[PDB]
Design a protein around this nucleic acid. Structure first.
Ligand code: MG
Ligand code: MG
Ligand code: MG
Ligand code: MG
Ligand code: MG
Ligand code: MG
Lengths: 101, 49, 171, 517, 195, 88, 315, 79, 132
DNA sequence: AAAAA
RNA sequence: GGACCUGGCGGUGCUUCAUAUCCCUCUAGAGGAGCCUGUUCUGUAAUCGAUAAACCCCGAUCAACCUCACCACCUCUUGCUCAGCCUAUAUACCGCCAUCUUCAGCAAACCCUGAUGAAGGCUACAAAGUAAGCGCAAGUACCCACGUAAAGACGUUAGGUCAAGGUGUAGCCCAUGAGGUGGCAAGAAAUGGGCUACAUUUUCUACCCCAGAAACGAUAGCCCUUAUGAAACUUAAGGGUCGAAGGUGGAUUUAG
């Protein structure tokens, strides 16, 4: 049972990008070249444009795993900057202590 | 993967293991709203009927 | 997403909001409020809507020198326990709606003429069982302070007496 | 295996049994709730893959097959369903993992299923004979098993030892008044198996010896010969045969020690070393040895059991709860009868706290022997154990503890004795009274406390039970020592009004106390 | 329901061995240990928190299982598994002249059921190129082929080998690279005249 | 045991990061958080393979629940098989 | 109350017995310091507060000094001045007043017949289970001063000395650097120095010319500005010794001025080897034999530079 | 770090040296340059194995064989 | 007012314990940490999974014991040996406690691939320190 | 705005 | 109608101070100008909230086609995990915070005086005050005992937020719900903050000041190219002729 649709769409985009990634990587490798015949680049662009969206890594948004917040999320623990601060002030995770200098 | 965790929580709630007071309060509020006069709308009641 | 389950006491405090500003300033009415009924009382450990007998959580374990099996209840027993829970919650609601017979004194909502009972005994070991306290005057006193605004103070005049000529009064 | 906090500390034996059973039930219900939903244990995170993360499944994976599906439903409403499916889908019956399982699990239905599986198609003869013997041994039948074994031996094949063991069991144990005939039949079967070139295992010999010892009581030479033949086969023999031989030898030899010595020698020759594993209950021999040592006061059998059940391995020492309690009681009795006081106390402290508690008769004998040697220190623990064991033994234990302190008064250094007497009186009063009440009153009068003695006298005089003459004399002396015969007069009046034997004597004592004081 | 049982306070004598009580890493249970340890934040007129319900003592990793007599017994019991270090390898000079090849290992630790680590698959081959057949032309060619990875002061070669997810395969690849390097000393081409 | 090792105290490191105290228009108040950690390395010398394995086993059998451990053991070897006159 | 104290004492002594048994030493020689060491080794509490440390001392330190009972079963108190709140304080006041009048009588009779410090209120209230204020304490101190100024003798002398203490050391003079000889090293001496994140180790000699070497090379190539040159010349100028002292310092870390000040401090602390103590005292009172902990202030998350705020306006 | 991580027991000659995967490719031109580039890329990839490189080579071969006219008109002869 | 997780000082009637009674800035001074693992140091990763497992274990322990616990629970992640050392109240039968402990240990060992052993503490009720 | 043999 | 008590206030009197505060006073900034980012206005179909000392590179430590809560077109009435809202109340909350806070006062148990009225209980050469507890001092860490950081109660602002996250009350699921393609940061105009310089204090060249020279620098816009991105309508950078008010600011202010 889920309550939010934004996190569901984000994780679905992540899964579809994880599934469809080798083809996009090969197309991007075939694109950026020095010389190379132009027909190969043209057909690579056609193949990468014929595929629909909902699979591009650009469409992936890093959000929290409990609150789904798009801004203010540390990549170390991957969550919002409120629940982590509260759990740190409660005295649970070691090391994360208030800066007393 | 929150799906398996939610399914396990619902299974423990139906069997009577994970005594979650939040779901109990939600069910209490739903029962109170139903007995007051605002039940959950069903198919065929609202705009058409 | 689904891990937003907090603690029960915090949920009850948020649903009731006892520290409301509308009750400490005289701006709102005391009748307009929400009542509370507890749910953690008549729920034994390991009780659901399917039925599973536990050899250690309910029935005795050592039954005639043998271990009992772990089966599943049918439908009639489930209906019976549901009816029992319904009767229990109905009895709870009935007990929570019955009001005690308030012994009136001189009139209706007036503390004058109400017997409080025997006074508190002294710490030395002296107990006053013959004397009886009586409420005479009750009034709410307000005073504009500096921070609390209208500080409410209750001033009650209670008299004492036993019935042998020796009596007194105090405010 | 339990816990360490005092609220969950294994004190007595019933608490340990209940905790172990609760742990087993919890493990069973956990396995049930895990295997109930296979869709919740399909994600493996650990790369090395722990083998304890694969749930077990009970449903077949291929329903189009017949024999394979039946085998998966039976072994890897079970056997009957598999047989019905094989009969409906026309599946052939094999000789492995089929007839033996039907004869063991599913004794009329199992025998019928084995006969049907044997007569369905022409499978193996030795396996069919073994299945028939296993089905007939559990239904009191030996002629059919013997005929099947003879047919399998004469059909140019080598019969297994399981069929011969089942036949010997059904012929010896499932009979009445037979000892020499069973031994002769076993010898003939062994000779036939040796002549027909068949390897005989020690399990069949052990089963034959157990069945021969479980019948007659004077069967000593045959049991010894069977034990020697089982030991002269390869490794150590099974412990069930040795336990049966010891039980058969100790049941007849109760006046002399020759039978006990022969049984001990047979047990040492069959399996007298480390934790030998070839039987179904190796602790039975240790339990029988402990019972024999506790009933006959043997100093060598208990020592041999302690040396063979604790030095090598801690497996053949205590298997069941009653066996462990009997072994602990026998060890306590041996320590009380052989060692002095300090060594006996050390053994009791290192044995009762490590394992379970004692039994009953041996525990009472050890308590009496400890109390007869002036040792009243663990009276509260003994009273608690007697109260937790039963509602009738606690009063007897309290009476036995107060009988050694009621007649003794307070001397120069009698603080521990007075404390033990007070504890015994409290345990006797908190049992739910005549003899116990009289003993408590005598202890309170001999202790020295006047208020406690007066309370005990008032409780005994109002319980519709008068005491003995010694308590009345002590009360009269205590009343006359303070120049006040009112207590003696009241005691005499209570004894005369309750219809007791203290009438003329009580009146004379009251008159003497009033005249002298 | 309710019961009362004496803990280990009345059971411990005077000469009881400590590792025999807690042989495993025990988290210090105050209900069984009769040690009156007290810590916390006291007040002006009162006493600090004792041992009952003391969560701070449970948080602190106690080392009661590291009894000195237990350490002595463990050290005396593991003397059979220890081999013998020869006296010829005590000095650094002979140890380096007889064994110049060095292969560093990588063994990290994790906090979960998985022990995988992509950083624990790299070997550091530190071979001192001073105990081989290094002449003049061969040494110059090796230096010009390496560049800056070979230090000209301590003469220690440093090659980061981590192109396969195994350690023995990394060692074999490093040995093959050293073989190809040493092949240049015995197999020339035709571009040495224009040096 | 008879190994005779050395031990010194390398400099420590403190990881610091600043987080917002609230969530709204309160930029003047920030609650920073640090991450104090220490380092104590052991300088061991003269240990064979079996001795090092036994020492690592005895260390791991008494490992806490909040420390790290990286093992960098260098083995000794004269020369391999193909290094003098190899083929391809 | 006493039963709980006895329980705590017996628990403490059985714990001490168990600790001495598990450690492997004799319980009689198992002093309290060894107890604390064993507790710190077995219970490593890694905190910053000194009160949250696992201790196991006598219950006299854990429990505060409980006030004893001054009345019995009859009801009469044991002290004379008990019906007045404070008993010991007023008794001591009466005693010191009696001593004062005795001293006055003795002085009158003599005329007719012709390092340490006082107590603290905190220490006083910790020694005597009694609470007081400040004005009464000042009055008691003034009475003690009047007692001391009078003609004392022996009895009153020891009576007023029992209410005294002892101050700590007051000579904050630094240790004189001895003369070290390292392989034909006459007039050789070293020193250190740490200020404004700069470490210097000067090597002062008394047999060369008048130059300064910084990390091998001279100071001209390393200190192009005359500021550092004057800062390094100031110590040699304060002693009137320039062309007869040569130094060779190896400074590292910090800027030009920080390293210059570090070398200056090192030279000042190293020159205390071939001169009297009066000269080093004159150098210390002028600003040489002293540390400079002027470190950069910690910036605050909300201020411009650890002092000035951001852009706070009025409207 | 070797328990359950042997990488199918493949040796280093198949991971590093990819010379045994150059058969249906020319020796001169941009095709051989691209092959050398992808060989240098796969040879310095410690995250993949021999199977991934074989799959990549097979996919490249299939992509080259599918578009044959492009390779013919790309001013080169696909050998 | 920076209202944090500290207990508010109002009327003397809340039986506050000793854990969350202190201020949130006295953690590294007059308190401690409930959880402890290698993920909280420099150079280590996979801390999100550890935090998720910790919060899930806390929720499970709070749900399976509706009132049987006192304060919180101390976590000790010793590589692959989790220990949920906590306390227990003296209000229910020991059979139920043993059953719950065994069920929790089996669930942990069969789900999180880690054996767990408990160390219960005998306390009458909540470790109260102040009646404020 | 009273207390699961 | 008259009288008494407390708080706020008095452009109400006296007394001790303003260690960065008010001038006589020292330095650096905001409306001299440009670029970037916000409030608000206008047009369009194109979120919203705070918008008064305590809001203006604020929610957002990321808005080129999900993030996007808006609009135009096409579908689904289990309407996706038998469950919610992308709609209104923070005058229903839990939770996270703000100027006061650059200090020290407030709450349980007693007694006395106000004839036992609301209230007050300060005089150490002492006339009735004892006070558990809270916050600072006392305490932790860094460069110790200096200094800094972390903290600093009971509340006014129905203060900011149902818009970290969840819960009460209204309306709906044959929608005010959900999925697909594109557009939304465009300009009559007012306003705050950050950076840049407004020449011999500046600019350049190698050594960061024993040097030399030319009587100055960052930004529109334009062309090419580069790291990621399926495709630069902008925030990134490098190259190139042109290169916009600039020549030290007067009505009011802030910190050290
Ligand atoms: Mg603040
Ligand atoms: Mg919506
Ligand atoms: Mg609002
Ligand atoms: Mg303070
Ligand atoms: Mg603060
Ligand atoms: Mg608002």
């Amino acid at each position: 049972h889920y309550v939010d649709w934004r996190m569901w769409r984000d994780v679905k985009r992540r899964k579809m990008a994880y599934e469809y990634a080798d083809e996009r990587l090969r197309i991007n490798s075939l694109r950026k070249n020095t010389i190379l015949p132009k027909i190969l680049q043209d057909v690579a662009d056609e193949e990468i444009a014929a595929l629909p969206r909902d699979s591009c890594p650009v469409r992936i948004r890093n959000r929290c795993v409990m609150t789904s917040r798009p801004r203010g999320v540390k990549r170390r623990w991957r969550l919002s900057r409120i629940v982590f601060r509260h759990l740190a002030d409660h005295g649970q995770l070691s090391g994360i202590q208030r800066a007393t200098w | 993967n929150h799906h398996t965790y939610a399914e396990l929580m619902q299974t423990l709630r139906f069997l009577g293991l994970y005594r979650d007071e939040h779901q109990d309060f939600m069910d209490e509020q739903k029962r109170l709203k139903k007995l007051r006069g605002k039940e959950k709308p069903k198919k065929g009641e609202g705009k058409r009927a | 997403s689904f891990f937003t389950k907090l603690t029960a006491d915090e949920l009850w405090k948020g649903a009731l909001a006892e520290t409301g500003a509308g009750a400490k300033k005289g701006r709102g009415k005391r009748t307009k409020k929400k009542k509370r009924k507890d749910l953690n009382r008549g729920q034994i450990i390991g009780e659901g809507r399917y039925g599973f007998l536990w050899p250690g959580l309910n029935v005795p374990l050592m039954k005639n020198g043998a271990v009992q099996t772990i089966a599943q209840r049918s439908k009639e027993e489930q209906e019976k326990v549901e009816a029992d829970m319904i009767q229990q919650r109905e009895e709870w609601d009935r007990k929570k709606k019955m009001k005690v017979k308030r012994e009136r004194g001189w009139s209706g909502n007036s503390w004058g003429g109400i017997s409080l009972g025997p006074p508190d005994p002294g710490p030395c070991g002296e107990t006053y069982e013959d004397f009886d306290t009586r409420i005479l005057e009750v009034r709410n006193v307000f005073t504009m302070t500096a921070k609390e605004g209208r500080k409410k103070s209750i001033r009650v005049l209670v008299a004492v007496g036993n019935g042998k000529g020796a009596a007194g009064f105090s405010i | 295996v339990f816990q360490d906090d005092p609220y969950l500390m294994p004190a007595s034996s019933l608490e340990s049994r209940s905790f172990l059973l609760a742990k087993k039930s919890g493990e069973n219900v956990a396995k049930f709730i895990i295997n109930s939903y296979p869709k919740y244990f399909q994600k493996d995170i650990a790369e090395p893959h722990i083998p304890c993360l694969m749930p077990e499944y009970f449903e077949p994976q291929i329903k189009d097959i017949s024999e394979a599906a039946l085998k998966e439903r039976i072994e890897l409403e079970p056997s009957t369903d598999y047989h019905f499916q094989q009969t409906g889908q026309s599946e052939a019956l094999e000789e492995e993992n089929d007839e033996t399982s039907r004869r063991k699990a599913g004794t009329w239905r199992a025998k019928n299923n084995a006969e049907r599986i044997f007569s369905l198609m022409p499978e193996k003869n030795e396996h069919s004979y073994c299945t028939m013997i296993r089905g007939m041994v559990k239904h009191r039948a030996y002629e059919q098993a013997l005929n099947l074994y003879t047919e399998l031996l004469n059909n140019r094949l080598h019969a297994d030892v399981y069929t011969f063991n089942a036949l010997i069991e059904a012929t010896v144990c499932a009979i009445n008044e037979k000892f020499e005939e069973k031994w002769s039949k076993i010898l003939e079967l062994l000779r036939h198996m040796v002549a027909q070139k068949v390897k005989p295992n020690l399990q069949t010999f052990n089963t034959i010896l157990k069945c021969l010892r479980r019948f007659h009581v004077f069967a000593r030479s045959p049991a010894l010969q069977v034990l020697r033949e089982m030991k002269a086969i390869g490794i150590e023999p099974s412990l069930a045969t040795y336990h049966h031989i010891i039980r058969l030898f100790d049941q007849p030899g109760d006046p002399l020690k020759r039978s006990s010595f022969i049984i001990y020698d047979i047990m040492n020759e069959l399996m007298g070393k480390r934790f030998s594993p070839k039987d179904p209950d190796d602790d039975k021999f240790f339990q029988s040895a402990m019972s024999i040592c506790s009933s006959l006061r043997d100093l060598e059998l208990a020592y041999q059991v302690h040396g063979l059940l604790k030095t090598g391995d801690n497996w053949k020492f205590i298997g069941p709860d009653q066996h462990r309690n009997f072994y602990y009681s026998k060890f306590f009795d041996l320590i009380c009868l052989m060692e002095q006081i300090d060594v006996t106390l050390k053994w009791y402290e290192d044995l009762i706290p490590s394992a379970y508690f004692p039994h009953s008769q041996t525990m009472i004998h050890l308590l009496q022997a400890l109390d007869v040697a002036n040792r009243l220190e663990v009276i509260p623990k003994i009273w608690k154990d007697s109260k937790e064991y039963g509602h009738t033994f606690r009063s007897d234990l309290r009476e036995e503890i107060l009988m050694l302190m009621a007649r003794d008064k307070h001397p120069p250094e009698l603080q521990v004795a007075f404390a033990d007497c007070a504890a015994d009186i409290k345990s006797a009063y908190e049992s739910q009274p005549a003899t116990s009440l009289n003993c408590i009153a005598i202890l309170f009068l001999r202790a020295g406390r006047t208020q406690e003695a007066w309370k005990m006298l008032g409780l005994f005089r109002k319980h519709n039970k008068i005491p003995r003459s010694e308590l009345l004399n002590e009360l009269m002396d205590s009343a006359k020592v303070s120049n006040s015969p009112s207590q003696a007069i009241e005691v005499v009046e209570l004894a005369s009004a309750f219809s007791l034997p203290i009438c003329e004597g009580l009146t004379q004592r009251v008159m003497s106390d009033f005249a002298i004081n | 329901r309710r019961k009362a049982l004496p803990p280990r306070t009345e059971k411990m004598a005077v000469d009881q061995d400590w590792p025999s009580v807690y042989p495993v890493a025990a988290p210090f249970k105050p209900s069984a240990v009769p040690l009156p340890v007290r810590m916390g934040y006291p007040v002006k007129k009162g006493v600090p928190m004792a041992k009952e319900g003391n969560l701070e003592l449970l948080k602190i990793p106690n080392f009661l299982h590291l009894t000195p007599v237990a350490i002595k017994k463990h050290c005396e019991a593991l003397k059979d598994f220890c081999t013998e270090w020869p006296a010829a390898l005590d000095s650094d000079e002979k140890c380096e002249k007889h064994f110049p090849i060095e292969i560093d290992s990588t063994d990290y630790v994790s906090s979960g059921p998985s022990v995988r680590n992509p950083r624990a698959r790299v070997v550091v081959l530190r071979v001192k190129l001073s105990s081989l057949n290094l002449d003049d032309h061969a040494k110059k060619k090796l230096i010009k082929l390496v560049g800056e990875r070979y230090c000209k002061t301590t003469d220690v070669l440093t090659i980061k080998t981590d192109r396969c997810p195994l350690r023995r395969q990394n060692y074999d690849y490093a040995v093959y690279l050293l073989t190809v390097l040493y092949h240049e000393s015995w197999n020339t081409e035709e571009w040495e005249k224009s040096k | 045991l008879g190994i005779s090792i050395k031990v010194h105290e390398p400099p420590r490191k403190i990881e610091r990061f600043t987080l917002l105290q609230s969530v709204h228009i309160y930029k003047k108040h920030r609650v920073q958080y640090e991450m104090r950690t220490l380092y104590r390395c052991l300088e061991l010398e003269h240990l064979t393979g079996s001795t090092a394995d036994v020492y690592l086993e005895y260390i791991q059998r008494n490992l806490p629940e909040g420390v790290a451990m990286e093992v960098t053991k260098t083995q000794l070897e004269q020369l391999p098989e193909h290094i003098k006159e190899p083929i391809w | 109350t006493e039963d709980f104290i006895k329980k705590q004492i017996e628990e403490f002594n059985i714990g001490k017995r168990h600790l001495a048994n598990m450690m492997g030493e004799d319980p009689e020689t198992f002093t309290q310091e060894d107890i604390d060491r064993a507790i710190a080794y077995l219970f490593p509490s890694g905190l910053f507060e000194k009160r949250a440390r696992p201790v196991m001392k006598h219950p006299e330190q854990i429990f505060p000094r409980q006030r004893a009972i001054q009345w019995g079963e009859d009801g009469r108190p044991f002290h004379y001045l008990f019906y007045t709140g404070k008993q010991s304080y007023y008794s001591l006041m009466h005693d010191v007043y009696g001593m004062l009048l005795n001293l006055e009588k003795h002085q009158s009779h003599l005329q007719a017949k012709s390092g340490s410090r006082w107590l603290i209120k905190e220490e006083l209230e910790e020694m005597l289970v009694e609470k007081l204020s400040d004005l009464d304490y000042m009055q008691f101190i003034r009475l003690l001063e009047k007692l001391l100024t009078s003609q004392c003798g022996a009895a009153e002398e020891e009576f007023v000395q029992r209410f005294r203490r002892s101050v700590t050391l007051e000579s904050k003079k630094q240790l004189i650097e001895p003369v070290q000889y390292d392989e034909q090293g006459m007039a050789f001496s070293k020193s250190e120095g740490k200020r404004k994140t700069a470490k210097a180790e000067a090597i002062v000699y008394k047999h060369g010319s008048g130059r300064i070497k910084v990390n091998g090379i001279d100071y001209q190539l390393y200190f192009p500005i005359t500021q550092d040159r004057e800062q390094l010349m100031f110590p040699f100028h304060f002693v009137d010794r320039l062309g007869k002292h040569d130094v060779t310092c190896t400074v590292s870390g910090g800027g030009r001025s920080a390293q210059a000040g570090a070398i200056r401090l090192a030279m000042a602390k190293a020159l205390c080897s071939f001169v009297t103590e009066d000269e080093v005292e004159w150098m210390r009172q002028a600003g040489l034999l002293t540390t400079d902990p002027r470190v950069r202030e910690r910036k605050k998350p909300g201020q411009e530079g650890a002092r000035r705020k951001f852009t706070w306006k009025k409207r | 770090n070797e328990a359950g991580f042997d990488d199918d027991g493949s040796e280093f000659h198949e991971h590093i040296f990819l010379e045994k995967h150059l058969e249906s490719f020319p020796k001169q031109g941009p095709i051989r340059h691209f092959m050398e580039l992808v060989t240098c890329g796969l040879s310095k990839n410690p995250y993949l194995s021999v199977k991934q490189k074989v799959e990549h080579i097979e996919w490249f071969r299939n992509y080259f064989n599918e578009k044959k006219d492009i390779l013919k008109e790309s001013n080169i002869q696909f050998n | 007012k920076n209202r944090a997780a500290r207990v508010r000082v109002s009327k003397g009637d809340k039986p506050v314990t000793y854990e969350e009674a202190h201020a949130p800035h006295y953690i590294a001074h007059r308190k401690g940490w409930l959880s402890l693992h290698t993920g909280n140091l420099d150079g280590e990763d996979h801390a999100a999974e550890r935090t998720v497992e910790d919060v899930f274990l806390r929720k499970f322990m709070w749900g399976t014991f509706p009132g049987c616990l006192a304060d919180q629970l101390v976590l000790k992640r010793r590589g692959n040996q989790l220990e949920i050392c906590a306390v227990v109240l003296r209000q229910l039968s020991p059979h139920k406690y043993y059953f719950l402990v065994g069920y929790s240990e089996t669930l942990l060992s069969y789900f999180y691939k880690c054996p767990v052993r408990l160390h219960l503490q005998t306390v009458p009720s909540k470790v109260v320190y102040k009646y404020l």
